[PDB]
Design a protein around this ligand. Structure first.
Ligand SMILES: [Zn+2]
Lengths: 102, 8
């Protein structure tokens, strides 16, 4: 059965709290990332998803937390739950994103 | 973004 990798960060507010030290430098604001299922690692711009455990870094100004989530961690339960399967499929179809993936 | 960790 499925169970989140980090049960402690299953709550949005708990995730948001980790972004206290998040660099103000980055365009991806704490709200966007936390709502996407991410919590800050405390190092650089590294984040991890509470459900799948996957971690993303090196965020570009043009990156949307949800898109990056669905593109790289397409098997993630939280993405499927909040965004749906079609979104995941559409994300992977967008040229710019498809190329990131290679 | 690029992943630094992906599930097994
Ligand atoms: Zn995930």
């Amino acid at each position: 059965n499925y169970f989140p990798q980090y049960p402690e960060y299953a709550i949005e507010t708990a995730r948001l709290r980790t972004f206290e030290a998040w660099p103000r430098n980055l365009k991806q604001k704490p709200h966007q990332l936390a709502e996407a299922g991410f919590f800050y690692t405390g190092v650089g711009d590294r984040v991890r998803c509470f459900s799948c455990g996957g971690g993303l870094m090196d965020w570009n100004d043009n990156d949307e937390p949800w898109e990056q989530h669905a593109l790289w961690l397409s098997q993630c339960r939280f993405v499927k739950l909040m965004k749906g399967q079609l979104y995941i499929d559409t994300v992977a179809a967008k040229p710019v994103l498809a190329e990131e993936k290679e | 973004a690029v992943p630094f960790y992906l599930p097994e």
